[PDB]
């Protein structure tokens, strides 16, 4: 059955490998008959810093407290989705600040977590992260593990996403296209195969 | 010997536990004869998003290419220091987007990596968390944070020695761990000079 994905995309450039990954993933989605919408956070000029007001609201732990309009819009986008996707380059072993801020501001008390329960209704999340380092190298530095723990674990499974998968699209150092085609295939496959998961 | 510390502080609120942590840490530094400068990133209106123009510069990998004025100022502040400190609340298992963006923008090619130009004897991380350090150690999050913050972002750019204190148990409405955590923060300032040496 057709699924609808909300894809969070975090990159300042119009053209970069991350954009190609987005194109490949959506290509795979289309082949399988799935749809998507994109939260192109840089192009949206999405505010990434949790404000003093928002912080005080979060600390107050009042699930019915107001949220800013941009966060309300994000929640509406998620509400239309059966799946989430996150497409970004690995910067200093985590997401770009812009996407980190999306978690800080959008994973709100009473929505992503409350006292622990959740209101997020998402069957699957796909993380497609491109890195300069190879997957082999990222495993050795504990960085691959940190990504599974922090991104897949804490930020996704930890807020009620039912199933998660990640492709670390590694080896993407400047001026080296050797891993490009293989990584784009992995992205296409991820979109084509969205409906399938563990049980 | 007296050391100078450049302290990166990341929190939107005028009053928070992190602010008291800063106060406790600075008290210890002064007790021990050390000096410091605080970079209050929110107060500074610090731009946390790596822009398209900065991105192109970083990808080009030209050590001598121009840097934004705000980044140049950060490099001067670091240059005056013998030590760095990072004081922030744990948000979604990493630092606030504001501090993440500081790494994205300030750890530039030709400076933080290329070899390194960073000349810093010690970095201290004081991270306040809702979860206890015990629970974070148990789940793998503490290890992830060591791999990411201590490993990649600090040791990985040439910092010679690193320490992280997880000041945990700071859940809303509970002051039970407050005094002990402030004691730890103060101690970290007082004991800044402590370092391992060959037997
Ligand atoms: C600011 C910055 C930080 C980066 N940090 C890492 C890193 O921590 N680990 C890694 O493997 N690659 C790192 N890289 C390399 C990027 O992951 C790589 O350039 C990216 O995946 C390429 O995708 P893009 O063309 O969409 O930018 C970094 C690149 C930049 C510009
Ligand atoms: C947006 C947000 C995200 C948080 N994420 C985490 C987390 O991932 N793990 C954790 O142990 N505590 C988390 N907390 C609890 C904070 O770490 C806690 O509020 C903070 O340490 C208190 O210090 P402060 O008064 O300086 O903000 C989070 C709090 C907020 C507001």
Author numbering:
A (entry chain B): -1 to 113, 118 to 201
B (entry chain A): -1 to 112, 119 to 203
Excerpt from the publication:
In the present study, the gene product of gene ID 9704440, here referred to as MmNQO, was cloned, overexpressed in E. coli and characterized biochemically and structurally. Based on the results from these analyses, gene ID 9704440 codes for a soluble protein of 196 amino acids. Based on structural and biochemical data, we suggest that FMN and NADH are preferred, which justifies that MmNQO is annotated as an FMN-dependent NADH:quinone oxidoreductase. The biological function of MmNQO is yet to be elucidated, but from the data presented here it may constitute an archaeal counterpart of the modulator of drug activity B in bacteria.
The crystal structure of MmNQO features a homodimeric enzyme where each monomer adopts the flavodoxin-like α/β-fold commonly observed for NAD(P)H:quinone oxidoreductases. The active sites of both monomers are situated at the dimer interface, each with a non-covalently bound FMN molecule bound approximately 8 Å below the molecule's surface. The flavin isoalloxazine ring is firmly bound by the protein with its dimethylbenzene nucleus interacting with hydrophobic side chains (Trp89and Trp90 from molecule A; and Leu48 and Tyr53 from molecule B); the N5 atom of the central phenylenediamine ring forming a hydrogen bond to the backbone amide nitrogen of Trp90; and the O2 and O4 oxygen atoms in the pyrimidine of the isoalloxazine ring forming hydrogen bonds to the backbone amide groups of His135 and Ser91, respectively. There are two non-crystallographically related homodimers (A/B and C/D) in the asymmetric unit of the crystal. In each dimer, one monomer (A in the A/B dimer and C in the C/D dimer) packs such that the ultimate histidine of the C-terminal hexahistidine tag is reaching into the flavin pocket to interact with the FMN ring in a crystallographically related molecule, i.e. His203 in molecule A interacts with the FMN in a crystallographically related D monomer and Asp156 in a crystallographically related C monomer. This interaction places the A-His203 CE1 atom 3.1 Å from the O4 atom of D-FMN. Although local conformational changes may well change the precise details and relieve steric hindrance, His135 is very strategically positioned at one side of the FMN cofactor to restrict the substrate-binding region, a feature that does not exist in bacterial FMN azoreductases. At the sequence level, the region responsible for binding the adenosine part of FAD in SmMdaB is overall very similar in MmNQO, i.e. loop A (residues 9–15) and loop F (residues 173–182), including an important interaction offered by His9 to the FMN α-phosphate group. An additional interaction to the monophosphate is provided by Tyr53 in MmNQO, which is absent in SmMdaB. In the FMN-bound state of MmNQO, loop F is folded around the monophosphate moiety whereas in the FAD-bound state of SmMdaB, the F-loop is folded away to accommodate the adenosine ring.
